[PDB]
Structure formats: C-alpha cells, structure tokens
Amino acid sequence: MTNIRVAIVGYGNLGRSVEKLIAKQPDMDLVGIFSRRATLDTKTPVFDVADVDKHADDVDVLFLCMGSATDIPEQAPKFAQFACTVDTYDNHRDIPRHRQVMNEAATAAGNVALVSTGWDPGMFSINRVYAAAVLAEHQQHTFWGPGLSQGHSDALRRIPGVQKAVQYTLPSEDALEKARRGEAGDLTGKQTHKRQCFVVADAADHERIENDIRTMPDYFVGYEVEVNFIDEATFDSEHTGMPHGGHVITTGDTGGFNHTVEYILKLDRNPDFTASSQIAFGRAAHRMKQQGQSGAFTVLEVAPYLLSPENLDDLIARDV
Amino acid sequence: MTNIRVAIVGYGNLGRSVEKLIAKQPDMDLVGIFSRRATLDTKTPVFDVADVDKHADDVDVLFLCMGSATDIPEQAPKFAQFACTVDTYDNHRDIPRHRQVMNEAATAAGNVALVSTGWDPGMFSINRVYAAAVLAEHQQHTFWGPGLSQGHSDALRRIPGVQKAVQYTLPSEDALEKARRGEAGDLTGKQTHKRQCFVVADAADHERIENDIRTMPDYFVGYEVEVNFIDEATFDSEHTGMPHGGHVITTGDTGGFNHTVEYILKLDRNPDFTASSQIAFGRAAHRMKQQGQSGAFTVLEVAPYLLSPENLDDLIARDV
Ligand SMILES: NC(=O)C1=CN([C@@H]2O[C@H](COP(=O)(O)OP(=O)(O)OC[C@H]3O[C@@H](n4cnc5c(N)ncnc54)[C@H](OP(=O)(O)O)[C@@H]3O)[C@@H](O)[C@H]2O)C=CC1
Ligand SMILES: NC(=O)C1=CN([C@@H]2O[C@H](COP(=O)(O)OP(=O)(O)OC[C@H]3O[C@@H](n4cnc5c(N)ncnc54)[C@H](OP(=O)(O)O)[C@@H]3O)[C@@H](O)[C@H]2O)C=CC1
Prior knowledge:
With 320 residues, chain A is an alpha/beta fold. In chain A, 34% of the residues lie in helices and 25% in strands. Chain A is built from eleven helices and 14 strands. In chain A, the strands form three sheets. In chain A, strands 3-2-1-4-5-6-14 form a seven-stranded parallel sheet, with helices on both faces. A four-stranded mixed sheet of chain A has the order 8-9-10-11. Chain A has a three-stranded antiparallel sheet with strand order 7-12-13, with helices on both faces. Chain A is globular. At the A-B interface, α1, α3, α4, β13 and α10 of A face α1, α3, α4, β13 and α10 of B. One NADPH dihydro-nicotinamide-adenine-dinucleotide phosphate binds next to α1 and α10 of chain A.
C-alpha cells in the first residue's frame, strides 16, 4: 500500500499546486512542508528546511519547489542526500551540469533524482525526442503559448507610470500553418510569435507608454505587438490568471510523402499542470529506487508505464 | 562498433516502406528479405522464409511485416528464436496474449522482441498513457482517419473470392468536437467511427462476402459497416492512396481549472510513417539486448532515448 511518503520543499505557487493535487493521488501520503518561513497559509504541518536531516526516514520523495534561478542549483544537491528528489528546473543551458552534480550526490546516498520535469522542460522534451527519432530527416519547431510571460510582464512594469500590467506571448497562427506544411524553415523568432500587452495607466500617459513599449529594445522591438489600456476592474477580473501552453510540430518527408506530428498543450493554470507532471515523475522515482537504481535521470530516461498508478498488465490490456 | 544488421519478413506495403527507409538510417545495414514468394522486384537479396534458420547468426534484428489478421499469431513467435524482432501487431483485444507467447520465445533464446509498435498501436498508446497518468481526473478519446486502414484492408483481402479490397475508417466530426470541449463522455470508438468497404468480386459471391465481413470478429463486429461492390476499373483508379491519421484527446480539471492534451498525426502515406516508427523501436530492441535484457516488451516499457541515433549527452544538451 506504498502510500509513498512525500514532502514539499518550498511553498510558492508550484508548492501549493503540488499540495492540492496529492489529495487526488491514490498512493501518496503528504508528510508536511519544509519551508524557510515559519507561518504558512495552511493546515499541513510545517517544518524548518534545516531540519530536513531529522525527518529522513518519514519520507520517500521530496518534491523541490523552490526557485530555479539560484536556489535549485545550490540547495538541490544536498537534499538528494536524504531522499529521492524531483525538480522542474527550467534553465536549459544548465541542465547537463545540474544533472551531473545531482548525479554525484544521489548515487552516493543511493537515492534516485529526477530532474527537470514539468511541461517544458518535461512533456515537450519527450515529444521533441520521440518525433525526431522517428522521422529520420525532419523539421521541428516549438511554439509557446498562448500564455503569460513574467519576464516581459516585468519589463512592462518597470515602465514609468504603468500601474498594473501583463504581456501574453501568442503563437503566430500563420507561422503554425506553415510549420505544419514543412515551410517554416526560414522564419525568425520575431515571426513565430506575437505579443499582446494589457496595461492599466492614467489616460494622460497612454501615448508615452505605448511608445515606450513598441520601441523597447530586446523585449519588444521587432515584433507584432498589440496594446490595450484597460480599466483596473477588468484587469483584476480578467488578468489575474496564469495560463499557458504551446505546440511541438515536427514534419518529415519519406520520398514525396509528408507527415506531420503535432503536440498541443492548453493550460488554464501553469503551476497546476506543472505539479501534475512533477507528481507523476515522483511515483516513477520511488519505483526506480525500489528496483535498485540510483543517480539522476532526465525525463528521457524513464519508461512511460512508470508514471502510472495502474498496474502494467492493466495498462497493456486497455490502452495499448 | 557498431552498424546494426537487419532483415525484413513479409514484403507487402509495410515491408516495402521499411526497405526504402532503412537507407535513411546512419547505423543500419539491410542484409536481406525473407518472403513466401520467389520473385520480388527489388535488388535486395531475397530469402526463403523457411531459411531464417540459416541467417540467425548474421542479423541483429528482424522486422516482421506480415498480416496481423492471420499471419502474425502463429508465425511471429518462431522468429523470436533467431534474433530480436519488431512487429506492428494491431488486434488490441489479443495483445496481452501475443505478448506472453512472444515473451517466452524471446526469453528462451535470450533475445528481445518489441510488440505492437506503429502509430495505433504505438505512438497513440504512448500518448494515451502519458496523458492519463499526468492528469489524474481526466476524459480521453481517440479518433482515427479519415484514412486507409492497413490491417482492415489486409483482413478483407483474406476473404475468399475478394479479388481486390480496401477499407476506409471515418470518424465523426461531431464527436471530435464534443471531445475537445470535455463533452463526449461515455462514447466509444465503435460508436464514433464508421467502417467503409470497397470490394471487387463476382456478383455470385456477393452474399457470402458481405456476411463474412459483417461477422468478422472484432475487426468488424460492433461497428457500423458499409459494403460497396465496385467495378475493377473504378477501383483501380479511385482507390490508390494510403493516407491516414488521427487524434488522441484528453481533458482534465485540476482544482476548477482545465487542461487539454492533444496529439495529432496527419500522414500522407500510412506504411511510411508506420515503417519509421517500427525502425526506431528496432534500434531500441538491439540496444536493450546489448544492455543485457531479453524477453518481449510493449512500447510503454522503453525509455524514449533508446529510439534515437544520437548519444544521450547530446540529446540532453540539445533537446531537453
Ligand atoms: N519545467 C516547467 O514546465 C516549469 C517549471 N517551473 C519552475 O517552478 C519554479 C517555482 O515556481 P513558483 O512556485 O511559481 O515560484 P515562487 O516564487 O512562487 O516560489 C518559489 C519559492 O519562493 C519562496 N516564497 C514563495 N512565496 C513567498 C513569499 N510570499 N514570501 C517569501 N518567500 C516566498 C518559497 O520558498 P520558502 O517556502 O522556503 O519560503 C518557494 O519555494 C520556478 O523557478 C520555475 O522555473 C514552473 C512552471 C513550469
Ligand atoms: N500498429 C500500427 O500502427 C500499424 C500496423 N500495420 C500493420 O501492418 C500490416 C501489414 O500491412 P500491409 O503491408 O499493408 O499488407 P499487405 O497486404 O501488403 O502484406 C501482408 C503480407 O502479404 C504478402 N503479400 C504482399 N503482397 C503480396 C502479393 N501481391 N501476393 C501475395 N502475397 C503478398 C507479404 O508476404 P510475403 O512476402 O511473404 O508473400 C506481406 O508480408 C497490417 O496487418 C497492419 O496491422 C499497418 C499500419 C499501422
């Protein structure tokens, strides 16, 4: 009855999303939260992150939901000392090193570390690899969105006189249809997406701002940008969500015959879906260590059935 | 090391596609073809299927491209004795059994057999699994076509007195939409697809071919079926292409938020894509064997990176 004993390290949006979804898992028990703050908006027990050493045996897997930017790279390796570990670290350029270092740690403690799960990296990585592997010579693209970009939203905000603001990254529909036909080979980043800004600001300032936006080097110049100055009420009512999604499109030619494989995600709420993967890869981590494996692995190294709470035979009988 | 030695068994549409596509691979050498027929139009060496026996020592893996309806079930298991094998076996209700017997033959000879690969079963099965696992509470549907079903076409053709035949599968566009809006629940493939038959045969035989068709165990029973007896000309001109494809749709709700996972295939030539998938799993099979495994496995049981001609470090560096 496994009830694989889990805990959460870090209590932000993600951390909250994991907490809430564990109730819908048949086989997991939440043993509590490890936090750097004493007092959280919650009934699950809270512990001091420094005291993780002491709880070592109440826990099977630790979901690491702290920051990618600086926390993960430094804190994560020590945690693999105490249990299996799953993270959603999204810095592509650092993955190889993160894994290498996560690898020396987990191996020495005999734990299993799953790194860089989520939707991208995660689901979209898997799909990229599958479709590219299949379609020998192939053309591949990843579009993001439609969804929230915190980095672009932050740039907007630093603008003088902007009160509240958000920017969405949308895929250029033209650009999708073209990739679908194997014709998007010579297209730049400025052509593949479009940006849609929603700004709350005094009417006196609209012209300067809109100008400040469309000329913003590196963040905004070069794109199709659409700008809306909205009431604070419509802002709060409609632009307080965290949606996102994307497309992985791969094409290949087999001698005069085209094939297109498209993977699409539509998420009403980013950290909820990200929690969903992370949780599924947590179950896989536990099963992997149960089979005597150890070290760090990416989502590319785990057989699919491992994420499932159903028994293999049942999966083979119904879904194959 | 290094170049995998490979052979085809069954030289029909699939077998020809696999022939064509092996050229596109960097790490495979096609050693020959094993056929029940003496004269094949190809420059590849051909062999008597009764002679596999003698080539066991110089092939690392055998692609089984005989008919699922009748050939696979008794023939396959005997191939497992001589090398790794890879099939695209399609009778869902008979897969677990197939796997058992293939496992036994494989495990005995120390080989690896990969069963039921292709797109459905194959890629569609994998997608079904990742999505239902990730999203705890979900609704999931699959839709095939409009396109030409290879298994269904080969089935019709094994009915005595059928000179020529082809079958098209037609999905219900309405169902497809309700699905996208999480509203088609409690609907099945059998109620969402129509089966269309184009047949060439003497009018005298019409009565009994129609009976055999509509009473064809789970290849045809339970579906709405249409039988069209047409002139050879009309058939030879109007029914020549082999397109197909479909959609796997899954919808789920986290605490009051929705997510949709969509997987799509648009294939210009059915055998060509199927062949490309069968090939990548062939690479996986050979690797698992060197890696020390043996026995029969489903597509749910192989880590994605095993299908790729690239090194894992590169895959991780570039695609994750
Ligand atoms: N791979 C993927 O597809 C995806 C990956 N991610 C990754 O998820 C990571 C975490 O995201 P997210 O949860 O949204 O980030 P947050 O900023 O919400 O929280 C991160 C950390 O901040 C601390 N913290 C949170 N709230 C407060 C607060 N009010 N005051 C003080 N400290 C606080 C928490 O640590 P403590 O509890 O110790 O205070 C927490 O672990 C990101 O770095 C991201 O890259 C996200 C989506 C997708
Ligand atoms: N899992 C998946 O997604 C997919 C699986 N499939 C499977 O692939 C299978 C093969 O389909 P396909 O290649 O279209 O079928 P064919 O009718 O072309 O061939 C089947 C066998 O018939 C024999 N054959 C071929 N041509 C002739 C001929 N002219 N006269 C007499 N015998 C001949 C060949 O054996 P021999 O050389 O020994 O005579 C061949 O192996 C199907 O059963 C289908 O299930 C197809 C698509 C997808």
